[PDB]
């Protein structure tokens, strides 16, 4: 099958449409239906509203819904010994490394700043209560 993304071989093209499973590109997706098929993705079901200039729809019942939302807050805090990583226990390397200036200090500083931020991120989210109820 020839598509805008390239040449697709081994997939069975169909004239149906479904929700996108594995995206290929240019509106084309593939899924396992068994064999692998290729199709144009659907954007959803069609729904026509019965609009008029004197008609209104009003709920007579309701439901209670509970959904979940997940957010990252922090990373693992790390630290690197620049000299040890590069030179190990060699004093020959250590002395050579001095000719490059303060690169190791700069690297340690950058990682330290990140590590501190991770604790701030946690406090900002969870420590919003003044007392323990």
């Amino acid at each position: 099958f020839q598509t805008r993304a390239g040449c697709l071989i081994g997939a069975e093209h169909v004239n149906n449409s479904y929700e996108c499973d594995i995206p290929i590109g240019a509106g084309i997706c593939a899924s396992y239906q068994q064999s692998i098929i290729a199709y144009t993705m659907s954007l959803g079901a069609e729904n026509s509203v019965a609009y008029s200039n004197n008609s209104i729809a009003i709920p007579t019942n309701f439901t209670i819904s509970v959904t979940t939302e997940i957010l990252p807050v922090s990373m693992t805090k790390t630290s690197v010994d620049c000299t040890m990583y590069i030179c190990g226990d060699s004093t020959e390397c250590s002395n050579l490394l001095l000719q490059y200036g303060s690169f190791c200090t700069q690297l340690n500083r950058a990682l330290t700043g990140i590590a501190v931020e991770q604790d701030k991120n946690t406090q900002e989210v969870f420590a919003q209560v003044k007392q323990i109820y």
Partner: protein, 209 residues
């Protein structure tokens, strides 16, 4: 919903995996020669004399220093993304958990009632409780009711008809009530409003006095 879907918490697992990969890459780079005769520093020192060993060592220093610098740069970029996420989580805590939000789709789908926090590995989970309308019905409506030459509007609702009788109801839940002077207000005559219909407006004090 969570227990039956092993990948439900992928958002947190992705963060863990990315950090682990970065460290593994940094370690594996130690095996590279970078043009040196050997990636093993001790072997170079044991075999070669100073004026020659230093040439081989500088090649390893350049490569390893470059690898470490690359690592740190990537961590700074990744950290910025995490900070943004934490800032959003902190906002949701304040607005969804410590209050009731009117922001659409901020605290889940539907009309927000309340939310509950739960802890998680390097993250937070919010349970959003919302109100969703159900089982709607068709009614005939009108912008105003004409009575005694005056135009009446709903105070807190909408005028509807069941095909034979007119009622006034709250908008988000069907609960039809008789149209009276206590649930409408009057403004102007009936000659201005487009789509105004004729109906009686009941005055509770009429039968009393």
């Amino acid at each position: 919903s969570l227990s039956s879907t092993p990948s439900a918490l992928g958002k947190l697992q992705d963060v863990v995996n990315q950090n682990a990969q970065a460290l593994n890459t940094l370690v594996k780079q130690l095996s590279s020669n970078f043009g040196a005769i050997s990636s093993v520093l001790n072997d170079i020192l044991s075999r070669l004399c100073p004026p020659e060993a230093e040439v081989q060592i500088d090649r390893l220093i350049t490569g390893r220093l470059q690898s470490l610098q690359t690592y740190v740069t990537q961590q700074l970029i990744r950290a910025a993304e995490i900070r943004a996420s934490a800032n959003l989580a902190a906002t949701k805590m304040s607005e969804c958990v410590l209050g009731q939000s009117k922001r659409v789709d901020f605290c889940g789908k539907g009309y927000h009632l309340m939310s509950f926090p739960q802890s998680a590995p390097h993250g937070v989970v919010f349970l959003h409780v919302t109100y969703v309308p159900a089982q709607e019905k068709n009614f005939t409506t009108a912008p105003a009711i004409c009575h005694d030459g005056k135009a009446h509007f709903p105070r807190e609702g909408v005028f509807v008809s069941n095909g034979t009788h007119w009622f006034v109801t709250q908008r988000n839940f069907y609960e039809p009530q008789i149209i009276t002077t206590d649930n409408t207000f009057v403004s102007g005559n009936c000659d201005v409003v487009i789509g105004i219909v004729n109906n009686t407006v009941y005055d509770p004090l009429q039968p009393e006095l």
